[PDB]
Write a protein that binds this ligand. Structure first.
Ligand SMILES: [Zn+2]
Length: 69
DNA sequence: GATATTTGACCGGA
DNA sequence: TCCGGTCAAATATC
């Protein structure tokens, strides 16, 4: 999983999120995560609130849809 | 609007 | 309390 190369454009979509000096290393280490990391979140939400007009019932609000598997 | 990078802060683990 | 991995605010460039 580790390789030695001379240009960093591996054709993947990378996003830099940090850079650290490392003890006993001459050069900093850069950190990248996938640009698409969050593109497949399940964004479905639900809100629940007892009704003012009827405390025996709940208003349930559905926001978004499920994409989870 | 929105997303990218830089870079010191922050935190967990040893 | 040192080290290193991640976060996030500032900043950039469009
Ligand atoms: Zn990916």
């Amino acid at each position: 999983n580790s390789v030695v190369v001379k240009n960093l454009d591996d054709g993947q979509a990378w996003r830099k999120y940090g850079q650290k000096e490392i003890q006993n290393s001459k050069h900093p280490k850069a950190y990248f995560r996938c640009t698409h990391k969050y593109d497949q979140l399940c964004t479905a939400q639900r809100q629940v609130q007892r009704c003012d007009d009827d405390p025996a019932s709940y208003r349930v609000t559905y926001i978004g849809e499920h994409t989870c598997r």
